[PDB]
């Protein structure tokens, strides 16, 4: 019969996306911030979220914040090369000392713009998973996930110390301005199990909530 085709396609045209495992990898790709210009980003893929494998956690060279990014889907992302990357292990100087910062409150020194001494209380959550001489750390009055070489910090005296599940679950946040923002819980902290990571659809930050 001689009709107009309508949702025409073909099964051949239909390749998988996110085939190759890029965990551990070093990546460059482009970034089109709105109508803005196409800058290049380089970084290191730390994890791939088990309960949403569209989602990668990237550490970008010289951004302190960990980024959750849906690397294949996201259309601000272009030209995604996986660099080959080295036979440089970087092992850890003192792992008795590193293994007793997991879990601890800490006080972390930051310069202000004038070069004056600011200290921010945080918590150290875990050692980062690919670059395992960095730590996941979150802060009390910035509760998103950050990454630093907290030994280097301790070493130069810039850091001090003192004494089932719902992973998968979609969640929304109740703004006092009426709207909602939908995300999902993506990780549970092995050290402080009352602590989880949320990732909201409209933002690349991983947020750390204590949910008990």
């Amino acid at each position: 019969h001689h009709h107009h085709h309508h949702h025409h396609g073909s099964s051949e045209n239909l390749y998988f996306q996110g085939s190759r495992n890029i965990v551990g990898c070093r990546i460059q790709h482009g970034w089109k911030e709105g109508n803005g210009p196409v800058t290049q980003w380089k970084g290191t893929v730390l994890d791939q979220v088990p309960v949403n494998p569209s989602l990668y956690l990237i550490k970008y060279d010289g951004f302190d914040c960990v980024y959750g990014l849906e690397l294949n889907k996201d259309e601000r992302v272009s030209a995604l090369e996986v660099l080959p990357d080295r036979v440089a292990t970087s092992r850890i100087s003192d792992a008795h000392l590193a293994d007793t910062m997991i879990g601890k409150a800490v006080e972390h020194m930051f310069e202000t713009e004038d070069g004056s001494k600011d200290e921010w209380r945080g918590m150290v959550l875990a050692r980062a998973p690919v670059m395992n001489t960095w730590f996941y750390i979150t802060y009390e009055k910035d509760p998103v996930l950050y990454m630093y070489q907290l030994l280097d910090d301790y070493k130069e005296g810039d850091l001090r110390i003192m004494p089932d599940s719902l992973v998968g679950k979609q969640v929304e946040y109740a703004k006092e301005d009426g709207s909602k923002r939908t995300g999902m819980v993506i990780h549970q902290v092995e050290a402080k199990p009352s602590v989880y990571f949320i990732k909201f659809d409209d933002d690349f930050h991983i947020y750390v909530y204590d949910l008990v």
């Binding site: 020194m109 310069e111 713009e113 600011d118």
Partner: peptide, 5 residues
Amino acid sequence: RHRKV
């Protein structure tokens, strides 16, 4: 010696 953004 860390700058806040």
